[PDB]
Amino acid sequence: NFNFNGLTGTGVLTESNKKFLPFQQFGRDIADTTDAVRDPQTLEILDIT
Amino acid sequence: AYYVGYLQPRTFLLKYNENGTITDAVDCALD
């Protein structure tokens, strides 16, 4: 049960193969859900499944 | 020899690629 800056939700988290732009935070899908965040104190990027 | 133009409200279509960078777009109300 994760929490990132107030974004709740469930699911599993893994490392990101996806390269990331140094101004965004959020990966959103077609289906209007969050698949990709960055830790707000660590520049690693995680994939949400 | 600088330029200048003005932005105005437009509906646009944006093609994010594999990397997540825009590569091409279409101005929906042009033609």
Partner: peptide, 23 residues
């Protein structure tokens, strides 16, 4: 004086990542 604004008047409109989709 005038020139043709070809296509480089475009930018990311928001801070939300997307990949491989026309949005």
């Amino acid at each position: 004086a005038y020139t043709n604004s070809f296509t480089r008047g475009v930018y990311y409109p928001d801070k939300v990542f997307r990949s491989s989709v026309l949005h």
